[PDB]
């Protein structure tokens, strides 16, 4: 018994999103479904749920009037529709149900969907600008102003020890930025080449940046 959620979505402010949550077996007919979201870096937040034994659907106050939770006729796919989207609604949305639907009268939420990322933004696809962070020494690449996530970085591809590629930060401009750094021996500089390899699949961007000692 798994819950299959629909895939990731990128949405503009003011638009609407409908996330599905399909049961691979059984229905939600006895114990219902609950939806929960999680904003980047934050905790879990209840959005609402169906409770069949009371014949009600409950919603969290912050979303009343702009959220609908429903199911299909056979009650084996459930949906959460969230309207008038704003950028604060960017989150991973989860559905959860009860394995007895394959006391404790309620959905114990022991079966969880894999989550659906919803990114709300007026940004358009944009590849990053890749700038070297010139130099045991440290050096890196700054991978700036891209949308949407993700990018990948490696340092071709010998070097893996001492590499740190940081989580991206969302800038107020609505574009992402991150840095990837690596520490190396001071002795190696100008005795060994260093190049960061960046990919942004949604744009069609691949960049190979040499990172060289500043030599005044």
């Amino acid at each position: 018994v798994q819950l299959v959620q629909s895939g990731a979505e990128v949405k503009k402010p003011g638009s609407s999103v409908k996330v599905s949550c399909r049961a691979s077996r059984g229905t939600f007919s006895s114990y219902g479904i609950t939806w929960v979201r999680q904003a980047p870096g934050q905790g879990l937040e209840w959005m609402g749920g169906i409770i069949p034994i009371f014949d009600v659907t409950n919603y969290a106050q912050n979303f009343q009037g702009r959220v609908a939770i429903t199911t299909d006729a056979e009650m084996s796919t459930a949906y959460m529709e969230l309207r008038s989207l704003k950028s604060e609604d960017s989150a991973v949305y989860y559905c959860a149900s009860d394995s007895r639907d394959f006391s404790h009268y309620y959905n114990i939420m022991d079966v969880w969907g894999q989550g659906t990322t919803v990114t709300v933004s007026s940004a358009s696809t944009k590849g990053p600008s890749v700038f070297p962070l010139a130099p045991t020494a440290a050096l890196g690449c700054l991978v700036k102003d891209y949308f949407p996530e993700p990018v990948t970085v490696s340092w071709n591809s010998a070097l893996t020890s001492g590499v740190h590629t940081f989580p991206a930060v969302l800038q107020s401009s609505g574009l992402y930025s991150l840095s990837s750094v690596v520490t190396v021996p001071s002795s190696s500089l100008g005795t060994q080449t260093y190049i960061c390899n960046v990919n942004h699949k949604p744009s069609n961007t691949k960049v190979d940046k040499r990172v060289e000692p500043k030599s005044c």
């Binding site: 409950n58 700038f131 930060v169």
Partner: protein
């Protein structure tokens, strides 16, 4: 509505040690409706305990819940490597249903001081209209660290962002990058760029800085 308060925010233990996690409700919860969940990075939560003390299917008996009224506890009798994760309690005795803010169980190790590195905006980026100054704190423990930016020794705020790696699976340390972003015009109008770091691993705050030019 009922506020769930978890403590401590971060529990730092060695593998094998017992973890006691607390969840306090702002008013009395019926016990029948108190649950605990575990969540690892980039995975969905998974239920550990429901009804305050009943263990979900297939959950190892090292996890146990207890408590009643306003006061609930999740105990992990000995920490296995896969148990380092974030734990949430939730009340569903009322609506809205609410979650605690989470407790992260992280690996304890000995204090390590960060290495601090500063990178001026790259010459290439200064062809653009923006300058990013970057400060690296490499391989430090504990997680708590303060990065303060100063521009001509004016403390900055509102204009930096930071990011931290997950605990390293080999040495249990963290790394952190802080980025100060300015317009190129603002970058040109000032001379001294400093990043001031404070970490319990350091006798006194460490400053790396440069002068533009």
């Amino acid at each position: 509505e009922i506020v769930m308060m978890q403590s401590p925010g971060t529990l730092s233990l060695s593998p094998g040690e017992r973890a006691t996690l607390s969840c306090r409700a702002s008013q009395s919860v019926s016990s029948s409706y108190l649950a605990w969940y575990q969540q690892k990075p980039g995975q969905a939560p998974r239920l550990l305990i429901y009804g305050a003390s009943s263990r979900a299917t297939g959950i190892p008996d090292r996890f146990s819940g207890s408590g009643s009224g306003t006061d609930f506890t999740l105990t992990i009798s000995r920490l296995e490597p896969e148990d380092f994760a974030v734990y949430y309690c939730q009340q569903y005795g009322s609506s809205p249903e609410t979650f605690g803010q989470g407790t992260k169980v992280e690996i304890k190790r000995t204090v390590a001081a960060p290495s601090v590195f500063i990178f001026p905006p790259s010459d290439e980026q200064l062809k653009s209209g923006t300058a990013s100054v970057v400060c690296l704190l490499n391989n430090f423990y504990p997680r708590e660290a303060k990065v303060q930016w100063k521009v001509d020794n004016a403390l900055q705020s509102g204009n930096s962002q930071e990011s931290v790696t997950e605990q390293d699976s080999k040495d249990s340390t963290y790394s952190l990058s802080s980025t100060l972003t300015l317009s190129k015009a603002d970058y040109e109008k000032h001379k001294v760029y400093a990043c001031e770091v404070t970490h319990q691993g350091l006798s006194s705050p460490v400053t790396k800085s440069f002068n533009r030019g």
